[PDB]
Amino acid sequence: VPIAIIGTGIAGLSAAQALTSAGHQVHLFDKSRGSGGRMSSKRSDAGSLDMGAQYFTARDRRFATAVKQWQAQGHVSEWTPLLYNFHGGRLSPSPDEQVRWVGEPGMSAITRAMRGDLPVSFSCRITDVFRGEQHWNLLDAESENHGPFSHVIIATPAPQATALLAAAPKLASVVAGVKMDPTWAVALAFETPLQTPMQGCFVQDSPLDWLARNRSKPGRDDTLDSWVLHATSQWSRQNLDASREQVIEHLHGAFAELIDCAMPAPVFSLAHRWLYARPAGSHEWGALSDADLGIYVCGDWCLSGRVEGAWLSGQEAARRLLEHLQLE
Amino acid sequence: VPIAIIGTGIAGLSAAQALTSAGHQVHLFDKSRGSGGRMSSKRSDAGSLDMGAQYFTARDRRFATAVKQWQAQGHVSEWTPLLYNFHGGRLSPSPDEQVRWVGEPGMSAITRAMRGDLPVSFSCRITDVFRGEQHWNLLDAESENHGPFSHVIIATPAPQATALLAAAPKLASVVAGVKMDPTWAVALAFETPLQTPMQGCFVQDSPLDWLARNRSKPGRLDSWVLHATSQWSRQNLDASREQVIEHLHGAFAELIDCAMPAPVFSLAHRWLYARPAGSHEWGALSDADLGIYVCGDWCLSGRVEGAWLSGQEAARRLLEHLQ
Ligand SMILES: Cc1cc2nc3c(=O)[nH]c(=O)nc-3n(C[C@H](O)[C@H](O)[C@H](O)COP(=O)(O)OP(=O)(O)OC[C@H]3O[C@@H](n4cnc5c(N)ncnc54)[C@H](O)[C@@H]3O)c2cc1C
Numbered sequence: 001v002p003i004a005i006i007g008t009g010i011a012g013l014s015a016a017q018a019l020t021s022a023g024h025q026v027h028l029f030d031k032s033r034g035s036g037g038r039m040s041s042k043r044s045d046a047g048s049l050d051m052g053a054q055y056f057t058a059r060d061r062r063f064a065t066a067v068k069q070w071q072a073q074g075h076v077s078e079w080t081p082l083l084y085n086f087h088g089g090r091l092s093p094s095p096d097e098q099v100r101w102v103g104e105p106g107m108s109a110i111t112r113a114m115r116g117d118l119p120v121s122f123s124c125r126i127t128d129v130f131r132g133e134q135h136w137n138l139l140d141a142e143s144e145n146h147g148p149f150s151h152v153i154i155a156t157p158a159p160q161a162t163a164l165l166a167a168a169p170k171l172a173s174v175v176a177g178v179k180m181d182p183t184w185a186v187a188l189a190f191e192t193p194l195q196t197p198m199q200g201c202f203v204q205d206s207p208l209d210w211l212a213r214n215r216s217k218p219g220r221d222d223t224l225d226s227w228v229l230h231a232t233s234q235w236s237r238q239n240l241d242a243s244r245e246q247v248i249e250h251l252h253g254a255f256a257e258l259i260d261c262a263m264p265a266p267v268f269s270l271a272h273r274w275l276y277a278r279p280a281g282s283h284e285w286g287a288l289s290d291a292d293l294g295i296y297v298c299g300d301w302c303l304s305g306r307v308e309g310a311w312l313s314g315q316e317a318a319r320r321l322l323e324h325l326q327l328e
Numbered sequence: 329v330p331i332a333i334i335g336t337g338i339a340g341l342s343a344a345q346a347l348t349s350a351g352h353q354v355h356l357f358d359k360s361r362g363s364g365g366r367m368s369s370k371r372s373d374a375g376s377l378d379m380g381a382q383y384f385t386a387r388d389r390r391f392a393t394a395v396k397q398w399q400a401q402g403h404v405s406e407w408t409p410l411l412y413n414f415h416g417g418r419l420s421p422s423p424d425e426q427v428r429w430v431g432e433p434g435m436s437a438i439t440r441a442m443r444g445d446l447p448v449s450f451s452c453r454i455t456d457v458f459r460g461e462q463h464w465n466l467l468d469a470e471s472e473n474h475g476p477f478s479h480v481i482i483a484t485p486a487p488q489a490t491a492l493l494a495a496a497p498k499l500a501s502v503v504a505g506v507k508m509d510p511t512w513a514v515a516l517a518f519e520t521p522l523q524t525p526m527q528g529c530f531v532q533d534s535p536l537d538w539l540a541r542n543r544s545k546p547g548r549l550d551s552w553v554l555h556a557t558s559q560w561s562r563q564n565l566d567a568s569r570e571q572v573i574e575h576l577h578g579a580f581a582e583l584i585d586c587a588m589p590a591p592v593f594s595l596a597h598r599w600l601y602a603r604p605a606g607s608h609e610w611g612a613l614s615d616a617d618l619g620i621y622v623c624g625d626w627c628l629s630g631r632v633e634g635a636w637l638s639g640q641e642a643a644r645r646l647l648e649h650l651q
C-alpha cells in the first residue's frame with residue numbers, strides 16, 4: 001500500500017526521493033499537466049520559458065551536495081550573467097560574484113529528473129484527504145477516489161494545503177496562518193536580439209526587482225531573445241487583479257525605463273500570476289506532521305521560502321515518516 | 329459591480345435573497361451542476377429522492393415566516409408520518425406533536441425557487457479568492473478569472489471554506505477548526521409496498537439512525553431512504569457504494585417487521601461533510617473591512633434553519649457595513 005504525495009514541486013519530489021531510497025513505494029499527484037511547480041518551465045512560441053524561479057542559490061551543505069549530483073547528471077549548471085543594477089533611475093554594472101544555479105536545458109529539468117518514472121497522476125486536483133479504519137484516501141475534482149494509501153504527504157503552498165487537512169484540524173489551523181505573497185512575472189521576446197551586453201539586472205525604485213535574459217543561461221540557444229521580468233511583491237499585490245495586458249504593458253514600461261539600447265516592439269509577450277509565489281516570512285519548522293495519524297506537510301514555507309528550503313522540507317517530511325515506521 | 333456568493337445551498341441562497349431584496353446584484357457559483365447542496369433531491373426511478381436533508385423544523389419566527397411563504401408558493405408542506413423507534417431491538421410507534429416540513433415535490437424545490445433566475449455559474453469550482461485595491465476576484469479550477477466583485481460571501485461546508493479564505497488568514501484558522509461529520513445515505517425501492525404502517529423511524533443500535541418512506545411525503549415505487557450514523561459512516565468512509573448498499577440494506581432487513589423482497593433499485597451517496605460535529609453561536613463569520621463574509625449551517629445549529637439564518641446574518645452584516 002503506497003504513500004501518497006500531493007504536489008510535484010521540489011518539496012514533494014524531494015520527499016519522494018527520500019522515501020523511495022529507503023525502500024517505500026509512492027504515488028504522486030498534481031493538478032498540473034506536469035511536475036516542477038514553481039520551478040516549472042513553459043514551452044512557448046518563443047521557446048522554453050522559466051516563468052517561476054529563474055535561478056537558485058545553495059548554502060546548506062546537504063542541499064549543495066544534491067545540487068552537485070544534479071550537475072554531474074547534466075541537469076543543472078552555474079549561471080554567471082553579466083549583471084547590472086538600476087537604482088536611483090541610473091543603470092550601472094554590478095560585479096556581483098554570487099554562484100547561481102539554473103536547470104538545463106530548463107529549470108524544470110531538476111524536478112523532471114527527480115520524478116524519474118515514479119508513479120504519477122497529472123491533471124489530478126485533490127480536493128479531499130480522508131481516512132478509513134486502516135488506510136488513507138484521496139478524492140479528486142472529478143469525484144474519483146484514489147487509494148488505499150498508507151500515509152499522505154501534502155507538498156503544496158500553505159493556503160492550498162488547508163483544504164486537504166480536514167482530517168487533522170490542529171495542523172489545518174497552523175497551516176491556515178501561513179501567509180504567502182504574490183508575484184507577477186512577464187516574458188517578452190524580440191525577433192532580433194537587443195543590442196546590449198546586459199544579461200540580468202537587479203532593479204530598485206521600480207515595479208520590477210529583477211530581470212533576466214534567457215539566451216545567457218547555460219544550454220539556451222533560442223533564436224528569439226526572450227527576457228523574464230519579475231515584479232516586486234508590493235507592486236504585484238497592488239496590481240493583483242490587473243489584466244494580463246496591463247501587467248505586460250506596465251512591466252514592459254519599467255524595462256524600457258532602464259534599458260541601455262533600442263527596444264523594438266516585442267513579438268511575443270506573456271504574463272503569469274503566482275498568487276502564492278513565496279512565503280511572506282520564514283520558519284524553522286522543517287515540516288509539519290501528525291505521525292500517529294499518518295499525515296505530513298511540507299513546502300518551502302516550512303523553512304526559508306526558496307528552492308533550497310523546499311528541498312530540505314521534503315527531506316524532513318520523509319525523515320519523520322521513516323522514523324515513525326522504524327519505531328512502530 | 330456585483331456581490332459573489334460561493335455555494336448555492338440554502339445558506340448561500342438565503343444570503344442571495346436578502347441581498348437582492350435590498351436591491352443588490354449577485355452572482356452565484358457552485359462546483360455542482362445544480363443548486364441545493366445538502367438539500368438537493370436525486371432524480372430516480374421512484375421519483376425525486378431526498379437523499380440529504382429529510383425534513384426540517386421551523387422554530388425561529390423569521391424562518392417560520394419564510395417557510396410559510398414557501399408553503400404559499402407550493403414549495404413546502406407539512407409532513408405527518410407515522411413515526412417509529414427501533415429500540416431494544418424492537419420496532420414500536422413513537423408519536424410526537426412536532427411539526428416537520430418537507431419541500432414539495434422534493435426537498436430541492438425550496439432552494440430551486442430561492443435561486444430562481446439569479447445569475448449563476450455551475451460546474452464552477454472556485455479555488456482562490458483574492459482582492460486588488462478596490463475589488464474581489466475569483467479563480468476557478470479551470471484557471472478562469474471571475475470578477476470584479478464588490479464583496480464575497482463564502483457559503484460552503486467549513487473545510488471547503490478554508491481554501492477560499494487565504495485573504496483572511498484569521499478567519500481561515502478559525503474555520504479550519506470546525507469539525508464536520510460524514511453520513512452515508514442509501515435509497516432502496518420496492519415494486520410493491522412493504523406491508524408495514526411505518527413511514528419513518530429513529531433507529532438505535534444499528535448502522536442506521538434514520539429511515540424514511542418517500543411515498544409518505546406530500547406530493548411524491550415504494551422508496552426508502554436510509555441514513556447511517558456518523559460513527560458507522562466514519563468506520564466505512566472509504567467503502568464502495570456497492571458495499572454500503574449491501575451493508576445498509578442488510579441493516580434495514582434486520583429491523584423491518586414485514587416481508588421484504590429484493591429491491592428493484594438501489595442508490596448510495598457519501599456526504600463527507602454532512603453536518604457539524606457540534607453547535608456554534610457565530611451566526612456568521614466576517615471581516616467586513618476586507619469585504620469577505622462566511623456562512624453555513626455550521627455557524628449555528630447544523631440544520632436547515634441554521635443554514636438559512638446564517639445566510640441572513642452574513643447578508644445583514646454586509647448591508648450594515650455599506651455605510
Ligand atoms: C516568480 C518566482 C520567482 C522565484 N525565484 C526564486 C529564486 O530566485 N530563488 C529561489 O530559491 N526560489 C525562488 N522561487 C521559489 C521556489 O520556486 C519555491 O520556493 C519552490 O519551487 C517551492 O517548491 P514547493 O515544492 O514547496 O512548492 P511548489 O513548487 O508550489 O509545488 C506545489 C505543487 O503542488 C501542486 N498542487 C497544489 N495544490 C494541489 C492539489 N490540490 N492537488 C494536486 N496538486 C496540487 C501544484 O500544482 C504544484 O506543482 C521563486 C518562485 C516564484 C513563483
Ligand SMILES: Cc1cc2nc3c(=O)[nH]c(=O)nc-3n(C[C@H](O)[C@H](O)[C@H](O)COP(=O)(O)OP(=O)(O)OC[C@H]3O[C@@H](n4cnc5c(N)ncnc54)[C@H](O)[C@@H]3O)c2cc1C
Binds near residue numbers: 484
Ligand atoms: C445526509 C444528511 C441528512 C440531513 N438531514 C437533515 C434533516 O433531517 N434536517 C435538517 O434540518 N438538516 C439536515 N441536514 C443538514 C442540512 O442539509 C444542512 O444543514 C443544510 O442543507 C446546509 O446548507 P448550507 O447552505 O450551509 O451548505 P450546503 O448545502 O453544503 O451547500 C454548499 C454548496 O457549496 C458548494 N461548494 C462547496 N465548495 C465549493 C467551491 N469551492 N466552489 C463552488 N461551490 C462550492 C457545494 O457544491 C454546495 O452546493 C442533513 C444533511 C445531510 C448531509
Ligand SMILES: NC(=O)c1ccc[n+]([C@@H]2O[C@H](COP(=O)([O-])OP(=O)(O)OC[C@H]3O[C@@H](n4cnc5c(N)ncnc54)[C@H](O)[C@@H]3O)[C@@H](O)[C@H]2O)c1
Binds near residue numbers: 423510603
Ligand atoms: N444525517 C445527518 O448526518 C444529519 C445532518 C444534519 C442534520 N441532521 C438531522 O437534523 C434533524 C432535525 O433535528 P430537529 O431538532 O430539527 O428535528 P427533530 O426534533 O425531529 O429531531 C431531533 C432529534 O430528536 C429525536 N426525536 C425527535 N422526535 C422523535 C421521536 N418521535 N422518537 C424518537 N426520537 C425523536 C431524534 O433523535 C432526532 O434526531 C435531526 O433529526 C438530525 O438527524 C442529520
